[PDB]
Amino acid sequence: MQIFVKTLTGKTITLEVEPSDTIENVKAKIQDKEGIPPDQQRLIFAGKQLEDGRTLSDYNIQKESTLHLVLRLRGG
Amino acid sequence: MQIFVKTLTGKTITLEVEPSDTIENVKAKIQDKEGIPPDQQRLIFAGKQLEDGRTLSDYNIQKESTLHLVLRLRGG
Ligand SMILES: [Mg+2]
């Protein structure tokens, strides 16, 4: 299924995922498409900062959902 | 000046800081007192995930302010 990722500059990424993908898998796919290290990615959805070991289905991320991606150089 | 840090278990940390301290300095002080690596710390205040290179004064963190600390193993 297709999901989207929006960035702070207004850009949209499209990803091919499954509900059983983990957030780790999703960040890895963003690295595959756009070269961003997973450790620099914060994915945010429905008011929650997403955890790498949980799945898309855990967060009710569905076909056509849009995640918010914020990049970071250090933790915070 | 004195600020406080609240955790998800309900515990309170007390820190001695200055408005010109960076968030990096604050996380380093939490490591000094409690041994938590800065890379595992997320400090959250007034609806903002705080950035390591900004100062307490940038976020209007004041005497008696309480930050929210959420620990993470991987970026998320
Ligand atoms: Mg130290």
B39: tokens are: 């890379």
B75: tokens are: 């970026």
Token look-up 């515990």 returns: B11
Measure the CA–CA gap between A27 and A29, rounded to whole angstroms: 5
Flag if A49 and B42 touch (Cβ within 8 Å): yes
Resolution of the coordinates in A?
A: 1.1
Measure the CA–CA gap between A53 and A47, rounded to whole angstroms: 18
What approach was used to elucidate this structure? X-ray
Measure the CA–CA gap between B13 and B6, rounded to whole angstroms: 7
Residue type, B71: L
How many beta-carbon pairs below 8 A join chains A and B? 50
CA-CA-CA-CA dihedral for A29, A30, A31, A36, to nearest 10: -160
User: Which pairing describes strands A2-7 and A12-16: parallel, antiparallel, or unpaired?
Assistant: antiparallel
B18: tokens are: 């200055």
Cα of B27 to nearest chain A Cα, Å: 8
Phi-psi domain of B33 (left: phi exceeds 0; alpha: psi -120 through 50; beta: other):
alpha
Of A49, A51, A76, the CB nearest to B23: A76
Flag if B39 and A75 touch (Cβ within 8 Å): yes
